């Protein structure tokens, strides 16, 4: 298979098929392998980027995940001061996901690569290796609830949060 974004090495994780044919998807089991340290000797740091709206995140998310639904906040958190590994031997990996990991997640993943390319001299990148969690939180929760907190799932279209949805969207750069 191809090398990661900066052509330095091969992708570390096993992938599964996903809608966006050019993106790399991983399963909930692989996500757990990362969380349980199965790759601790190679992966120095990995960040789980939850791109769902705040109320969805507050209703239940993956342990250690960071809520970065707005592009400007994701850019600030990831690129203002790039997350670097302990050594040049270990990797830094990003995992993006949303509710179904169908639209918001893939979009943010593409946005970050766009910005990474912009601030680098080809072919270097701060985040050469990025994946999308197949199925999003919706499929992850029913499989590994004890790796979530709180142990619940609040859908974007939850009936009691229609106002929260509108309030948040009016904060986005484009719709
Ligand atoms: Cl998909
Ligand atoms: Cl935005």
Swiss-Prot record:
It comes from the Eukaryota. Residues 42-149 form the Rhodanese domain. It is found in: Cytoplasm, Cytoskeleton, Microtubule organizing center, Centrosome; Cytoplasm, Cytoskeleton, Spindle pole. Phosphorylated by BRSK1 in vitro. Phosphorylated by CHEK1, which inhibits the activity of this protein. The active site is at residue 98. The modification Phosphoserine is found at residues 81, 174. Interacts with MAPK14 and 14-3-3 proteins. Tyrosine protein phosphatase which functions as a dosage-dependent inducer of mitotic progression. Directly dephosphorylates CDK1 and stimulates its kinase activity. Required for G2/M phases of the cell cycle progression and abscission during cytokinesis in a ECT2-dependent manner. The three isoforms seem to have a different level of activity. Belongs to the MPI phosphatase family. This is M-phase inducer phosphatase 2. It comes from Homo sapiens. The chain holds residues 391 to 564 of 580 of the full protein.
């Amino acid at each position: 298979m191809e090398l990661i974004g900066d052509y330095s090495k091969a992708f570390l994780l096993q992938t599964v098929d996903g809608k966006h044919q050019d993106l790399k998807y991983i399963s909930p089991e692989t996500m757990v392998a990362l969380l349980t340290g199965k790759f601790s000797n190679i992966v120095d740091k990995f960040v789980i980027v939850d791109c769902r709206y705040p109320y969805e995140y507050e209703g239940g998310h993956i342990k250690t995940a960071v809520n970065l639904p707005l592009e400007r906040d994701a850019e600030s958190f990831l690129l203002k001061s790039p997350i670097a590994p302990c050594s040049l031997d270990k990797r830094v990996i990003l995992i993006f996901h949303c509710e179904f990991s169908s639209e918001r997640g893939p979009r943010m993943c593409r946005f970050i690569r766009e910005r990474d390319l912009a601030v680098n001299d080809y072919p270097s990148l701060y985040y050469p290796e990025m994946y999308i969690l197949k199925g999003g939180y919706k499929e992850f929760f029913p499989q590994h609830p004890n790796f979530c907190e709180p142990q619940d799932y609040r859908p974007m279209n939850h009936e009691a949060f229609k106002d929260e949805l509108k309030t948040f969207r009016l904060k986005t750069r484009s719709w």
